[PDB]
Amino acid sequence: VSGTWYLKAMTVDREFPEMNLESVTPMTLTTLEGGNLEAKVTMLISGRCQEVKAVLEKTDEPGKYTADGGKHVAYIIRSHVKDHYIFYSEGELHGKPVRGVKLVGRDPKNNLEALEDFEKAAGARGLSTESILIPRQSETCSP
Numbered sequence: 001v002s003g004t005w006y007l008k009a010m011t012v013d014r015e016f017p018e019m020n021l022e023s024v025t026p027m028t029l030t031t032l033e034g035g036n037l038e039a040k041v042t043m044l045i046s047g048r049c050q051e052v053k054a055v056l057e058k059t060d061e062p063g064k065y066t067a068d069g070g071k072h073v074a075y076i077i078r079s080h081v082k083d084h085y086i087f088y089s090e091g092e093l094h095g096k097p098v099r100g101v102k103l104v105g106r107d108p109k110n111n112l113e114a115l116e117d118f119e120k121a122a123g124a125r126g127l128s129t130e131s132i133l134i135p136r137q138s139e140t141c142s143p
Helices: 112-124
Strands: 004-011 022-025 027-031 037-045 048-058 064-067 072-076 083-094 096-105 131-133
Touching: 004 022, 004 112, 037 083, 048 072, 083 112
Parallel strands: none
Antiparallel strands: 004 027, 004 096, 004 131, 022 037, 027 037, 037 048, 048 064, 064 072, 072 083, 083 096
């Protein structure tokens, strides 16, 4: 899964209306020695370019990862649709609990079959009434 991916869809959390995702850059996934994953992506949130970087540490359970010393737990399941993955995670952001589902794919273009799969995952996670944001794609970040 190493290489470039795109954040194609995501459930929006009601806990941080102060944080609005305006645009997102491509995502770079680099496979760490040991089975871990490094996800890098820059997000234009409320005017500022935030460079995000997460180190996903493997666990005894396939598809399950942790980060920030277990303070963040994530599940990465292959989508029924080729070149897509459904990402789910629970954690804390600024001391406030947060969880969401994200759709990532090799191609930035909208794929309705993948979106349907993503929507089914959001339903399974208990987030089906939350807003869904199909983010604007950008090659770079600039306010």
